[PDB]
Amino acid sequence: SETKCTLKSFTVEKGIYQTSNFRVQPTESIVRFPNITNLCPFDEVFNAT
Amino acid sequence: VIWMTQSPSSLSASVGDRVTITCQASQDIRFYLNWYQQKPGKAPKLLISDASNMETGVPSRFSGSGSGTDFTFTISSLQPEDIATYYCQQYDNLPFTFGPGTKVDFK
Amino acid sequence: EVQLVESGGGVVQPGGSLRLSCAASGFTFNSYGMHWVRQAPGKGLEWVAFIRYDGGNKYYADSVKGRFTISRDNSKNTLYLQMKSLRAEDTAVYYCANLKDSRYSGSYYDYWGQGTLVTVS
Ligand SMILES: *[C@@H]1O[C@H](CO)[C@@H](O[C@@H]2O[C@H](CO)[C@@H](O)[C@H](O)[C@H]2NC(C)=O)[C@H](O)[C@H]1NC(C)=O
Secondary structure (H helix, E strand, O other), X not given: OHHHHHHOOOOOOOOOOOOOOOOXXXXXXXXXXXXXXXXXXXXXXXXXO | OOOEEEEOOEEEOOOOOOEEEEEEEEEEEOOOEOEEEEOOOOOXXXXXXXXXXXXXXXXXXEEEEEEEEEEEEEXXXXXXXXXXXXXXXXXXXXXXXXXXXXXXXXX | OOEEEEEOOOOEOOOOEEEXXXXXXXXXXXXXXXXXXXXXXXXXXXXXXXXXXXXOOEEEOOOOEOOEEEEEEOOOOEEEEEEEOOOHHHOEEEEEEEOOOOOOOOOOOOEOOOOEEEOEO
């Protein structure tokens, strides 16, 4: 019926008839990055004696 | 996101007493709010749909009222099977948000 | 007479994946938009996902939007939740719910599942 809807007809003669497109979607979705160098210490400003 | 708050989150009352539970929203939900009851260890059973329409199979002790931002669940008498946790739900904006839930206890 | 039996719970390493399945048999199904609801152990009920009657529009909670996907198979009458990149804040009891909506799904009966304990350790 896909092919019929494509040739806009109800009779499909013999042969290969290209109808649709087959793209495979994705699953996950990562987000990589680097570790963590300096860390600008709040250790000294929130925790001074 | 439509935040809900429930009050009081802890409650202890004896038999025959009345219980009011206020559900407060952060936005305006007109009359779309569900009141569930969950006994500990089981799936929650619904009690009141659209904030006032009590269901079938539930006794007539429970009642719901209020509209707009403030809603009220009222138990006119505490039978021993009223000891559970009661939850809200809104319906206007997806996602639906449950309340934190109030615990009823015996004295 | 309604039966919502769920499966797929177990020990999951953090960052793993699961397929929670909900076999529904009783009501007609596929005329109702169905929900996944979760409850953390010792905490209140949260919300996970909602899918319409034809699998057209899916809606997720604002905290798990992207790590879960919700699908339905109307031929075998099942709900599926693909859970990828699980943290330790997802160890819970997942219920397969049909909430007495009346604005979006338009249901009238409240049919809850039983709940699977998904422990992410
Ligand atoms: C704020 O400062 C105090 C004192 O410097 C920190 O307490 C130390 O904590 C570490 C690990 O928690 C221990 O090994 C030390 O023995 C503690 N020292 C003292 C004197 O108690 C505290 O951790 C600091 N806050 C933060 C967030 O790092």
